[PDB]
Amino acid sequence: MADYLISGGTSYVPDDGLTAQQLFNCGDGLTYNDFLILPGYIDFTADQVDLTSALTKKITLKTPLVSSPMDTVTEAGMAIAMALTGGIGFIHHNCTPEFQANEVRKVKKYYPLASKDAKKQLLCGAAIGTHEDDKYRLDLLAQAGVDVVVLDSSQGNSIFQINMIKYIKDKYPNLQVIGGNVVTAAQAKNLIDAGVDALRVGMGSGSICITQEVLACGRPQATAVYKVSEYARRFGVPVIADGGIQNVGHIAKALALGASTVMMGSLLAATTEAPGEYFFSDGIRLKKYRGMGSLDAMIKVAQGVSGAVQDKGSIHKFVPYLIAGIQHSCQDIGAKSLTQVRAMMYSGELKFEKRTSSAQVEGGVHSLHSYEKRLF
């Protein structure tokens, strides 16, 4: 009868809010702090939220948390410790190729959901450049048995990177490539048609990044993630959001805008497994953290600063906190998996809301004298 025959059994669900297509096609460029996700319906607890995410077209991870190929973020210690907690690590290329191959064979010769391949060894990634001298680095890393390579450049739509991708896709046919950095859909077109397996989205949004203030180029991070994800889902290519991630909420928004995995350099810096040693400044324990374009890491123009960030403990205590935060955020969204989050987003069911500056002020902590924030 008429309880089913009118609308086909689906309930009313009063329309309130904006979809992702109605929000990011206004022409205005939004970052992570400029919007928020409207909540929905819960019929499940937070611990049964599946976090299975695809790194590349054939590599599948158990947590959507990858780590950045920087000289003060990841080496083989972080490549082990991110893999054991579900993610993957990318070992930087600010070193000799023998050293980087040593780090890749150090992680490869090494926990319930530990992201391991068919030979029961830990997954690893490594960064290479697009210069002709890096083909020897690629050969020496592929002899070490690297599973995925990322082509590290701040501007990914070059002829050099397209020729390097077409070199890898026939010299090493079982090796996965990650192209980047891209922020528009035309760059995603030029790299997907070259045969890339994943994209790396974000230019000018890093915490150690002065590309927008020296080279005047890039775009805001949330709009970048949405515009490259909406193009890259046409061909079945995952993207990787790097830059702009400051907390768990930015990770949840990046995963809800279409990014399959999230790359973190500063939120994972000054951890126990990050390379370097601790020191003190104004009575605060903190580890050094510099960008790859900074002149302390290289006429040379600097695209990075050389700073420091406070200690965050160990990473087997920090990554499960990020896991539980993403699970509680997917509970408040109302979806049992990240695939369901993105499926609700592209179908128009998952809705958003733009946020002004004084509504960003109330979104944090206000109206207090002094607070003692303990995340975990």
Pick the binder of a second copy from 94, 102, 121, 207 (CB under 8 A).
207
**Binding flag, residue 3, a second copy (CB under 8 A):** yes
| CB nearer to a second copy: pick between 98 and 132 | 132
Decide the pairing of beta strands 60-61 and 35-37: unpaired
Residues belonging to the chain: 376
Q: State how far the Cα of 238 lies from the Cα of 287, in Å rounded to an integer.
A: 32
Phi, psi of 204 (to 5 degrees): 95, 10
**Binding flag, residue 184, a second copy (CB under 8 A):** yes
Report what 313 binds from a second copy, ligand IMP, none; CB cut-off 5-8 Å by kind.
none
Q: Provide Rg for the chain, Cα atoms.
A: 21
Residue pair 242/263 in contact by the 8 Å Cβ criterion: yes
Residue 307, annotated as binding a ligand: no
Cα 372 → chain centroid: 29
Residue 234, annotated as binding a ligand: no
Residue type, 209: C
**Binding flag, residue 297, a second copy (CB under 8 A):** no
Catalytic-role residue among 26, 95, 124, 209: 209
Nearest in space to 263 (alpha carbons), one of 96, 74, 118, 97: 74
Residue pair 333/39 in contact by the 8 Å Cβ criterion: yes
Residue 158, annotated as binding a ligand: no
Residue pair 86/115 in contact by the 8 Å Cβ criterion: yes
Task: Write out the two tokens for 149.
Answer: 């390579």
CB of 49 to ligand IMP, least distance (A): 20
Report what 252 binds from a second copy, ligand IMP, none; CB cut-off 5-8 Å by kind.
a second copy
Pick the binder of a second copy from 159, 170, 173, 174 (CB under 8 A).
159
Residue pair 230/258 in contact by the 8 Å Cβ criterion: yes
Task: Write out the two tokens for 134.
Answer: 């890096």
| CB nearer to a second copy: pick between 25 and 96 | 25
Phi, psi of 196 (to 5 degrees): -80, 160
Residue type, 154: S
CB of 337 to ligand IMP, least distance (A): 25
Q: Considering only residues 18 through 37, tell me which ones interact with a second copy, judged by CB under 8 A.
A: 18, 21-22, 27-34, 36-37
CB of 146 to ligand IMP, least distance (A): 18
Residue pair 204/217 in contact by the 8 Å Cβ criterion: yes
- Residue 26: active-site member: no
Phi, psi of 61 (to 5 degrees): -100, 165
Report what 360 binds from ligand IMP, a second copy, none; CB cut-off 5-8 Å by kind.
a second copy
CB of 25 to ligand IMP, least distance (A): 25
Q: Considering only residues 265 through 284, tell me which ones interact with a second copy, judged by CB under 8 A.
A: 266-267, 281, 284
**Binding flag, residue 316, a second copy (CB under 8 A):** no
Known binding-site positions: 152-154, 202-204, 206-207, 209, 242-244, 265-266, 289-293, 303, 362-364
Give the residue ranges of the annotated binding site for IMP.
Answer: 207, 242-244, 265-266, 289-293, 303
Annotated binding site for NAD(+): 152-154, 202-204
Active site residues: 209
